[PDB]
Amino acid sequence: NAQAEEFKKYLETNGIKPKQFHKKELIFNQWDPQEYCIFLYDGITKLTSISENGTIMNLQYYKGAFVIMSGFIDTETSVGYYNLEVISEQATAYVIKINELKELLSKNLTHFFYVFQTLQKQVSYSLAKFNDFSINGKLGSICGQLLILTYVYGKETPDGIKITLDNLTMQELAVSRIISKLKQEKVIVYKNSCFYVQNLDYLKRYAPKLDEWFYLACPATWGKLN
Amino acid sequence: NAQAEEFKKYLETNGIKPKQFHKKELIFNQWDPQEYCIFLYDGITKLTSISENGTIMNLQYYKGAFVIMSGFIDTETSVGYYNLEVISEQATAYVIKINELKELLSKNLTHFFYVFQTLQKQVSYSLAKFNDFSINGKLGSICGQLLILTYVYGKETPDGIKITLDNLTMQELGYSHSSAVSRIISKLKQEKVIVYKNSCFYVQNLDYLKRYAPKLDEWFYLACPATWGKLN
Ligand code: NA
Ligand code: NA
C-alpha cells in the first residue's frame, strides 16, 4: 500500500510518531471528549460500542493500513461514541487530534484524497454487505467475512486456501449452526489447527456484492486467488 | 441548508447546470463506465444493485441535499455496480464527472470538507443502524427507520408527530408487509406509539422509538442536531 507508506512519511515528517498497542488495549474509548484520527498502520482492531446496561457490541473491524476517525473533520465534534480495541497481538497506529488532521490534510491534497477514499471504501463495503445480507441472510454475512479473510490472510496449499491468521485472532474475530453445516458441506476445513477454504466459489456465490467490492477496492489481492 | 446551497452556487459558478429527473428515471446505471459525483439537491433517490437473476435490491435511500459517488476520488475507479433511481415525482440533481469533482474540491477546501463530512455521516449512520440492530433485532431496526422518518418529515400536531410523506413514498418504503414486520407494527399501533389516521402516520410516543433505537437517535443528534432539536 504505497499510499499508506506515503501517508505515514507525511505524518512523521510533521512530527507525528508511531505508537504501539497490545491486545485488548484501547486506542480510544467512547467517553473521550477529544476527537481523533487514528492512522492504523499495522495490526487488527475492532470498533465496538457499550450500551447503557454494559453489553458490548462489536460493530466493525479494521486492519492497517486504514484511517478511523472519531470526529467530523470540519466541525470537530463526535461522529459517534465508540471504542477502538486492538485484537491482534500487536498494533502500530498514529494518533492525531482531529484539528491537526484538518490542518495536515488542508496543506496536502494527495493525502486528503487518500483519507477521502478510505471513507468511500467504508461506504461501499457497507452497501455490499447489506446487499449480500438482504439476499442471503446470515449465510451471506458469514460467507462475506470468510471471503474477506480468505482474500486477505489466504495462502494456497495442496490442502486448500489456508487462512494464515493466528488461531487466537481467529477466535477473537445460529452462527455455529451454519458454519458447522458449511464445513459439513466441505466449504471450509478446520484441519491442523487452522481453517482451510476449499470452495471459494461457494463463498463468492453467497456474497456476491462483497466479492465485487473486493475486486474493485483490492484488485491486486483479489487477483491472486482468482 | 446553508452548506448545501453554498455547494450548489459553487457548482453553478463553475458552469455545472442542474438537471431534472422524473420518477423511476435513472441518474446513472451500473454499466455506465463514466464515474460521477452526484449532488442530489432536491428529491429522493435509491441506490439499487441488480443480481445475476434480475432481482433489484434496494440498498439505501437518499434525500436532497446529499452527495453520491460512483468512483473513488483518488484512483478515479468505480466503487461498485450500482444504479441511482429516482423515487420522487421529480428530482433536481447536478451531474459532475469524478475528475471535474476532484478539480473543484482541490480549488475550495470548504466544499471538500462538506463532502468529506457527508461520507463521515454515512459511515457513522451505518454503524448506528447496525448497533441498534445488534441490540434490539427487528424491533430496533423498525424503531430506527420510524425515528429517522419522524425527524426528517416530522410535523407536530395535536395528533402527534405527523409523518409528512406521500402515501406513494410510504408505499415505496412499504409502511402503507413482511410477516415479522407486521407483527412489530401491529404491536406499535395497538400500543398507541404510532397511529395511522387520515391516510398518514402520526407519532405520539417518540420516547419509545428513541429508547429502542438509541444509537440512531445519538447519530441524528451528532450529525443533524438542527433537525434533532426541533423534536426535542
Ligand atoms: Na470518543
Ligand atoms: Na461506478
Backbone φ, ψ for residue B218 (5° rounding): -60, -45
The answer to whether position A117 is within a domain reads no
Tracing cell 445480507 back to the chain, one arrives at: A133
Asked if residue B103 and residue B152 are part of one domain, the reply reads no
Who's near B77: CB < 8 A, 6+ residues apart? A216, B35, B71
Q: Which of A54, A67, A53, A184 is nearest to A116 (CA)?
A: A67
Q: Are A70 and A141 contained in the same domain?
A: no
Q: Could you tell me if A200 and A150 are in contact, meaning their C-beta atoms sit under 8 angstroms apart?
A: yes
Residues A103 and A146 in one domain: no
Of B51, B75, B131, the CB nearest to A135: B51
CB of A1 less than 8 A from some CB of B: no
Q: Which residue numbers in chain A precede an interruption (C–N > 2.5 Å)? A: 173
Residue B182 CB contacts under 8 Å (≥ 6 apart), including other chains: none
**Resolution of the PDB structure in angstroms:** 2.4
C-alpha cell at B79: 466503487
CB B209 within 8 A of CB B203: yes
Question: Same structural domain for residues A148 and A220?
Answer: yes
- Per DSSP, A14 falls in state T
Please state whether the peptide bond connecting residue B65 to the residue before it is cis, i.e. omega within 30 degrees of 0. Answer: yes
Residues A11 and A96 in one domain: yes
In which domain, by residue range, is B97 found?
1-108
Q: How many domains does chain B have?
A: 2
Residue A47: CATH number of its domain = 2.60.120.10
| Residue B127 within any structural domain of the chain | no
Cα separation, A110 vs A47, whole angstroms: 27
Which cell numbers hold the place of B65?
Answer: 441535499
In a domain, A90, yes or no: yes
Instruction: Quote the DSSP letter at residue A8.
Output: H
Instruction: Compute the radius of gyration of chain B from its Cα atoms.
Output: 19
Query: Which residue's C-alpha cell is 506515503?
Result: A6
CA proximity to A154, closest of A139, A177, A170: A170
Cα distances from B173 to residues A31, B31, B42, B58, B165, in angstroms, run: 35, 26, 18, 10, 11
DSSP H or E run through A212: helix A208-217
B6 touches chain A (CB under 8 A): no
B 34-93 near A (Cβ less than 8 A): 47, 49, 51-52, 55, 57-60, 69, 72-75, 77-82
Residue A35 CA, ligand 1 centroid: distance in Å: 6
Read off φ and ψ for residue A52, nearest 5 degrees.
-55, -35
> Would you tell me which residues 110-169 of chain B have a C-beta closer than 8 angstroms to some C-beta of chain A?
110, 112-117, 119-124, 126-128, 130-131, 134-135
B75, B81, B222 ranked by CB distance to A212: nearest = B81
Q: Is residue A183 part of a domain?
A: yes
Contact B127, B218 (CB under 8 A): no
In a domain, B128, yes or no: no
Q: In terms of domains, do A158 and A59 share one?
A: no
Assess if residue B7 is contained within a domain. yes
Give domain status of residue B121, yes or no.
no
Please judge whether A213 and B55 are an interchain contact, meaning their C-beta atoms are less than 8 angstroms apart.
no
Q: A186, exposed or middle or buried, with CB in 10 Å at 0-12, 13-18, 19+?
A: exposed
Measured CA distances, A218 to A13, A66, A205 (Å)? 28, 13, 19
Selecting from A79, A109, A113 the residue whose C-beta is nearest the C-beta of B124 gives: A79
Q: What gap in Å lies between CA A8 and CA B37, rounded to an integer?
A: 28
- Kindly report the CATH number assigned to the domain that includes residue B184: 1.10.10.10
B104 in the same domain as B8: yes
Which experimental technique did the depositors report for determining this structure? X-ray
Q: What SS3 class is residue B1?
A: coil
